[PDB]
Amino acid sequence: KEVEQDPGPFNVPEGATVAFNCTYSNSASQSFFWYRQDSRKEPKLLMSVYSSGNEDGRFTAQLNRASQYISLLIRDSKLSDSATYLCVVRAGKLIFGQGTELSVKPNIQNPDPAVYQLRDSKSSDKSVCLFTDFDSQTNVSQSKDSDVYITDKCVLDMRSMDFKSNSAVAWSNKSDFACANAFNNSIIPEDTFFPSP
Amino acid sequence: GSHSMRYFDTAMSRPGRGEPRFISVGYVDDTQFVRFDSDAASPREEPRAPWIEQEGPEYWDRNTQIFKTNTQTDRESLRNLRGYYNQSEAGSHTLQSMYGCDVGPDGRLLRGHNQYAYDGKDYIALNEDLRSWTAADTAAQITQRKWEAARVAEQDRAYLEGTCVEWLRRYLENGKDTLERADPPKTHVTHHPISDHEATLRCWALGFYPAEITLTWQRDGEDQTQDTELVETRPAGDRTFQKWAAVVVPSGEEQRYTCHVQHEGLPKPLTLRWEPS
Amino acid sequence: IQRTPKIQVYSRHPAENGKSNFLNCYVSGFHPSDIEVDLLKNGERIEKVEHSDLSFSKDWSFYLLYYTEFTPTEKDEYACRVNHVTLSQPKIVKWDRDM
Amino acid sequence: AGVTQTPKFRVLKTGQSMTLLCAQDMNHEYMYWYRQDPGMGLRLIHYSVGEGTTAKGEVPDGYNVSRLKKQNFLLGLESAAPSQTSVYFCASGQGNFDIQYFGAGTRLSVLEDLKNVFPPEVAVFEPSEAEISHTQKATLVCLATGFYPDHVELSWWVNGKEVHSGVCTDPQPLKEQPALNDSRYALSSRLRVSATFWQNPRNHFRCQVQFYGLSENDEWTQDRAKPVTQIVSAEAWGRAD
Amino acid sequence: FLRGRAYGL
């Protein structure tokens, strides 16, 4: 207990805004601090609240010491903001909070979900299956053991083209499967490519 | 009816032989309602007053905590100050403070207080707007920059405008029997003459609660002062006070006057009269 | 900076003739807090000389009450002997029944 | 400038001895040594409010610490052993228990026996002919596997230079055989650039995996080549065909 | 209730 923070992964859209909630059992606490820890590195001080409310600049911090509420506000979200957002309460001797993840999803404008098969290098095709261009809406699930492996999605950002996109990997040592039966444990959209050749 | 809660912090430091002594006493209007001390004379015999026990280990445990972490923060202070003025490690120095809030009976905050004093000489103080500092010398100007950057002013105000207040009305409620109370005066005058023609007719006292017991050797209608040899109030020990003034009127115009007192709780003035009673 | 300590010798409860009382020494307004206080029955330190816990005034100066338990008489003389960093010699002051 | 915390990674055999260095520049009187486990919160081990002194938070264990000088806080593990297998953050900052500044952190893995330490096998996968002639783009996948523990850094190098434009690697590695805890790991990364930037045999794509393993003063009687800290990586050319 | 003084002079 002590410091009660938000639940789990919040998937706020890009341009949109987000608010966090933190609470403290010790009513007579003092100063509060919003740190930001990029999986997987070190907490970087983001906001600090010694009074009732603090700004500066794209991040807002509302503190009602009466209701015991300390909140973080992140307007105009960037795909970068994605990280675990620790909440720290001082009063007495500085107690850390478990934290609150946060994944800003991009706006796949021209989605065309597909699953290609990059050849490989070199001998013995490990059958790498690239699921990509699937809108941030569509989510992908896990696979099995044996000799196959999957990896949760991941965003790109070809900044030299102002284009973002998704992706997922799926390899194995010749079971042997292909592209149409690799991601057979998820919810595929209604236009996913499976070019046989 | 006009209330004020303030703490008297003290970080007197002993050099080498031992460690720095840290004292932090609390008052409400004038009621010492708690005393912390790094030298715990016997296991937590740190006076706590009556109306603070009902606050379970919860309150006191959290409170006793804050103390330690502060005493560590004024360990830094003592050695920064020593550095500002560049003083040997051999010497022993003192860091004192008074922070607390006054409010109107209606419950609103009137003013905030927070001053520091190094070796007895005012060093830095939180201004009446609770957002600026007033440096004594050039050293405190270093401290000022430090706190201006650190937003320390903001922090102190956050307290004075909240916890300080939100616990003053509360301390007044729980402990109303002693805070918003008075006390019986009792002031048995005395004669006691001396040499030749110049004698003495000192009053006296058994105490009260504050000490603003104004003992004036009047003179017809004009408040006499010169013909007075009064001494400072020297408490007593039984949790009461005293004081006495020594008028030196002749043995002819002796009782041409009677000493007064005036107090708190008592309704109308108790204009006293020097006369064997 | 350094302020000399105010010494005052006196007794509490109805200070009268030889019977029973306490007698204490109230040393106030001084700096720093390092002060030495002894109650002398005929010029020699008395045991169990308890004293109040140390607090300071609105001018930062300290004040302490060094009390004891005694029994006045008619020739049993007492005094208060105080020492402080600001005094070349320790200033001692006598006791007076009514004063 | 900043709060430096060395070393980044380090492998220990139970009962061995190592000491983490946390040094700072800001002249902060206050420093801290924290322990953070996967998904678990920040845990306070010791702290020092000055050039001497030290304190609690969570000490009853193989943690002792020294603030000899002010610039640096040293964390020493006398006789190592699980736990103590985690990620450590040292932190400093003026003000007592207020704002603080963490270092990069130290990823520690102390093993009962160094027989299961293994270097990573890296591989690169040439893009899809379909993707190219469909999305007018080009993606290169990289896959490093069989490495343990998970002490690695992944990076793409085109024409010798580092690149983040169109890169993406798994937040965490993937536990190959989740059947046992002490299982090897695996990682993947993506690098997508235009199609017209791909099929030109004058560009050198290089996925590279830095591995932090064993040093020198470790007795290794296994027939293997000893899992030393090294670099494993794979390259790929612009297959115009 | 005491104040949490985090910064020294």
> Mind giving me the DSSP string for C7-61?
--EE--TT--SSS-B--EEEEES-SSS-EEEEEEESSSB-S---BPPPEE-TTS-
Instruction: Tell me the shortest Cα–Cα distance from D100 to chain E, in angstroms.
Output: 12
Helix segments in chain B, DSSP class H: 57-84, 138-150, 152-160, 163-166, 168-174, 176-179
User: Which subunits count as partners of chain A given 3+ CB pairs below 8 Å?
Assistant: B, D, E
Task: Tell me which residues of chain B, numbers 161 to 180, contact chain A at a CB-CB cutoff of 8 Å.
Answer: 162-163, 167
CATH among 3.40.109.10, 2.60.40.10, 1.10.10.10, 3.20.20.80 for A1-106: 2.60.40.10
Q: What residues in A contact D125, CB-CB < 8 Å?
A: 118-121, 126, 128
8 Å CB contact between A115 and D128:
no
Are both D69 and D128 inside the same structural domain?
Answer: no
Residue B239 CB burial class (10 angstroms; 0-12, 13-18, ≥19) = exposed
CA nearest to B185, candidates B214, B203, B209, B202 = B209
Parallel, antiparallel, or unpaired for β C35-41 and C78-84? Answer: antiparallel
Give dist(CA D84, CA D43) in Å, integer: 12
Residue A91 near chain E (CB below 8 Å) = yes
* B277 within a domain of the structure (yes/no): no
Contact across the interface for D42 and A167, Cβ inside 8 Å: no
Are both B203 and B168 inside the same structural domain?
Answer: no
Give dist(CA B247, CA B259) in Å, integer: 10
DSSP structural state of residue A158: B
Q: Tokens 């003459």 correspond to what residue?
A: B193
Question: Residue D155, SS3?
Answer: strand
Reported structure resolution in angstroms:
3.1
CATH class of A107-197: mainly beta
Neighbouring C-beta atoms of residue A114, cutoff 10 Å: 21
User: Which residue of B lies nearest to D28 if distances are taken between CA atoms?
Assistant: B76
Are both D173 and D96 inside the same structural domain?
Answer: no
* CA max distance for chain B: 71
Give dist(CA C86, CA C36) in Å, integer: 12
Q: Which of D127, D165, D177 sits opposite A118 (nearest CB)?
A: D127
Give dist(CA B115, CA D96) in Å, integer: 20
Query: Checking phi first, is residue A127 left (phi over 0); if not, alpha (psi -120 to 50) or beta?
Result: left
Element containing residue A54 per DSSP (H, E)? strand A53-54
8 Å CB contact between B261 and B233:
no
For residue C24, CA distances in Å to A52, B217, C56 come to 50, 26, 19
Are both B26 and B158 inside the same structural domain?
Answer: yes
Are both B218 and B195 inside the same structural domain?
Answer: yes
Are both B150 and B201 inside the same structural domain?
Answer: no
Q: What residues in C contact B117, CB-CB < 8 Å?
A: 60
β-sheet bridge partners, residue D205: D158, D236
Instruction: Tell me the shortest Cα–Cα distance from B70 to chain D, in angstroms.
Output: 8
The range of the structural domain enclosing residue D21 comes to 1-112
Among A3, A127, A146, A156, which would you mutate to test the D interface (most chain D Cβ atoms within 10 Å of its Cβ)? A156
Instruction: Tell me the shortest Cα–Cα distance from B73 to chain D, in angstroms.
Output: 6
Are both B66 and B131 inside the same structural domain?
Answer: yes
Q: Where in chain A is the domain with CATH 2.60.40.10?
A: 1-106, 107-197
Are both D216 and D103 inside the same structural domain?
Answer: no
Q: Which of D50, D95, D97 sits opposite B150 (nearest CB)?
A: D95
> What CATH number corresponds to the domain at position B187?
2.60.40.10
The range of the structural domain enclosing residue B251 comes to 182-272
Are both B136 and B215 inside the same structural domain?
Answer: no
8 Å CB contact between D176 and D214:
no
Exposure pattern of A125-149 as b/e (b: 16+ CB <10 Å)? bbbbbbbbbbbbebebeebeeeebb
CA nearest to D210, candidates D124, D134, D137, D147 = D147
Alpha carbon dihedral B114, B120, B123, B129, in 10-degree steps, equals: 30
Contact across the interface for E9 and B77, Cβ inside 8 Å: yes
For chains E and C, tell me whether 3 or more CB atom pairs sit within 8 A of each other.
no
Those residues whose C-beta lies under 8 Å from the C-beta of residue B129, and which sit 6 or more positions away, are none
First vs last C-alpha separation in chain C: 31
Give dist(CA D154, CA D208) in Å, integer: 6
DSSP structural state of residue A106: P
Phi, psi of D184 (to 5 degrees): -55, 175
β-sheet bridge partners, residue A76: none
Strand ranges, E, within chain D: 3-6, 9-13, 18-24, 31-36, 42-48, 64-66, 72-77, 87-92, 101-102, 106-111, 121-125, 137-147, 152-158, 161-163, 167-169, 174-175, 185-194, 204-211, 230-237
How many CA atoms within 13 Å lie on the side-chain side of A87?
24
Neighbouring C-beta atoms of residue D128, cutoff 10 Å: 26
Which of B133, B151, B181 terminates a domain? The answer is: B181
8 Å CB contact between B13 and B78:
yes
- Provide the number of CB pairs (under 8 Å) joining chain A to chain D: 129
User: Which residue of B lies nearest to D49 if distances are taken between CA atoms?
Assistant: B72
8 Å CB contact between D36 and D42:
yes
Q: What residues in A contact B159, CB-CB < 8 Å?
A: 30
Are both B43 and B123 inside the same structural domain?
Answer: yes
Phi, psi of D129 (to 5 degrees): -60, -35
Instruction: Tell me the shortest Cα–Cα distance from C69 to chain B, in angstroms.
Output: 11
Neighbouring C-beta atoms of residue B35, cutoff 10 Å: 18
8 Å CB contact between D203 and D238:
yes
SS3 content of chain D, % helix, strand, coil (to 5): 5, 45, 50
What domain count does chain D have? 2
Exposure pattern of A85-106 as b/e (b: 16+ CB <10 Å)? bbbbbbbbbbbbbbbbbbebbb
Which of B148, B181, B214 terminates a domain? The answer is: B181
Give dist(CA A31, CA B158) in Å, integer: 9
User: Which residue of A lies nearest to D236 if distances are taken between CA atoms?
Assistant: A121
CA nearest to B20, candidates B82, B71, B61 = B71
Are both D230 and D118 inside the same structural domain?
Answer: yes
Q: What residues in A contact E6, CB-CB < 8 Å?
A: 31, 90
Give dist(CA B248, CA B242) in Å, integer: 20
Are both B74 and B118 inside the same structural domain?
Answer: yes
Mind listing the domains of chain C with CATH numbers?
1-99 (2.60.40.10)
CA nearest to B97, candidates B4, B5, B3, B11 = B11
What domain count does chain B have? 2
Experimental method: X-ray
Parallel, antiparallel, or unpaired for β D106-111 and D9-13? Answer: parallel
Q: What residues in B contact D29, CB-CB < 8 Å?
A: 76
Q: Which of B65, B151, B163 sits opposite A50 (nearest CB)?
A: B151
The radius of gyration computed from the CA coordinates of chain D, to the nearest angstrom, equals: 22
